[PDB]
Amino acid sequence: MNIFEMLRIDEGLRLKIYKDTEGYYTIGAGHLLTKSPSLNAAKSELDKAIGRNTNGVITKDEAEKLFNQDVDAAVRGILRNAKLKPVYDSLDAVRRAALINMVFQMGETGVAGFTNSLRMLQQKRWDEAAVNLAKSRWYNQTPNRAKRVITTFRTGTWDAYK
Ligand SMILES: [Cl-]
Ligand SMILES: [Cl-]
Numbered sequence: 001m002n003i004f005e006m007l008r009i010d011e012g013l014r015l016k017i018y019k020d021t022e023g024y025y026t027i028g029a030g031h032l033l034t035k036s037p038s039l040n041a042a043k044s045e046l047d048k049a050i051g052r053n054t055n056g057v058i059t060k061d062e063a064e065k066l067f068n069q070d071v072d073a074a075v076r077g078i079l080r081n082a083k084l085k086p087v088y089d090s091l092d093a094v095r096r097a098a099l100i101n102m103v104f105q106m107g108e109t110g111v112a113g114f115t116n117s118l119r120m121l122q123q124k125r126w127d128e129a130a131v132n133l134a135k136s137r138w139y140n141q142t143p144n145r146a147k148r149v150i151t152t153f154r155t156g157t158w159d160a161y162k
Contacts, residue, residue: 001158003071003097007104009161010145013063017042017056021142027056028063030104031070074100077108084108087118095121098152105145106138121153130154 011030017039020026025033025042033045043056050062058066078084078099088099099121102111112118114136120129130150133139139146151160 001161003100004067006097006158006161007067007071007101010101010105010148013060013067015058015060015063017046027058027066029067029070031063031066070104071100074103074108078103081108081112083112083115083118087122090122090124092156094156094158095153098149101149101152102138126154126156 007029013029014027017025017027017033020030020032024035025039025045027033027046031049033042033049036042039056043054046056046058047054049066050058078088084099084103088096091099099111114133117129117132120132130153133150133153134146136146139150148160152158
């Protein structure tokens with residue numbers, strides 16, 4: 001198991017524009033296109049991302065390319081973030097993937113906001129962090145996914161994904 005396989009299970013890989021859990025236009029493995037209600041705006045953003053007139057449909061390779069870019073950007077966002085970097089540096093390889101997953105889903109700013117959970121993770125207080133992580137909109141809105149990531153932080157294993 002690795003970060004790509006993990007996110008692929010969590011996000012899937014749709015080749016046609018679709019709406020995410022929040023109702024926003026997205027494509028591929030969770031690649032948000034726009035928060036605007038306009039399909040046209042979405043198609044515009046898509047064509048600009050891919051560099052061709054797509055008509056709302058992309059190929060698998062194109063989807064994977066967006067995926068690779070997005071994982072890369074999440075990692076780099078963490079590394080540049082003053083609140084996130086120290087946490088990431090303190091964790092083992094499995095837990096690092098879990099932090100990447102949250103950043104991928106909610107953005108650096110969003111995760112950087114889990115102040116208390118981050119401190120707990122840094123201190124290696126696993127069960128405490130897991131409880132704190134669950135007290136959030138994130139957990140209430142996407143419980144199954146959140147449970148998988150939390151278990152990953154709690155155990156340091158990939159059991160939730162196997
Ligand atoms: Cl892009
Ligand atoms: Cl879920």
